[PDB]
Amino acid sequence: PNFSGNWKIIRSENFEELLKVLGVNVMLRKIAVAAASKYAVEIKQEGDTFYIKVSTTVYTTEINFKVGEEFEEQTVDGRPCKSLVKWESENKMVCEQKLLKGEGPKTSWTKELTNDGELILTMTADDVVCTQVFVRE
Numbered sequence: 001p002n003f004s005g006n007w008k009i010i011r012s013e014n015f016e017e018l019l020k021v022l023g024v025n026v027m028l029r030k031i032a033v034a035a036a037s038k039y040a041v042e043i044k045q046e047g048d049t050f051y052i053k054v055s056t057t058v059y060t061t062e063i064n065f066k067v068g069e070e071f072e073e074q075t076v077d078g079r080p081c082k083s084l085v086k087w088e089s090e091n092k093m094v095c096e097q098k099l100l101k102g103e104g105p106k107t108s109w110t111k112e113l114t115n116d117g118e119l120i121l122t123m124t125a126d127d128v129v130c131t132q133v134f135v136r137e
Ligand SMILES: *C/C=C(C)/C=C/C=C(C)/C=C/C1=C(C)CCCC1(C)C
Pocket: 032, 035, 036, 039, 052, 054, 055, 056, 075, 076, 077, 109, 111, 121
């Protein structure tokens, strides 16, 4: 698996519907969808250790994890969570998340490297799945 790379988004499906579940009001959802157009993911993978940097025009966040060990990050709408990533197959991993404080929809995400050289990210909140497709820069 070579997840490593500089990935740029080419398609984003159901993102607004995802943010709706997460309680984001309509004007901010529209502004967020527009911001997801200028949006890049940088991945460094060594074995089952990952470094992931997610960037938009004005904001950037870094994620560090090892497959199989709990780490802390944030949900899509920004609330801290405990996360755990496992492989589903050679080139797909799934992350389950647990809210640190409080309650909300069940969130998770997946990353997959296709045989065509695309990266596919899915983000889920309850029954809503957002799919985003990236290609290498
Ligand atoms: C493994 C890749 C992951 C976990 C990517 C997560 C991506 C996000 C949490 C993206 C969030 C965004 C917003 C909350 C609004 C602005 C646009 C995005 C897509 C960068």
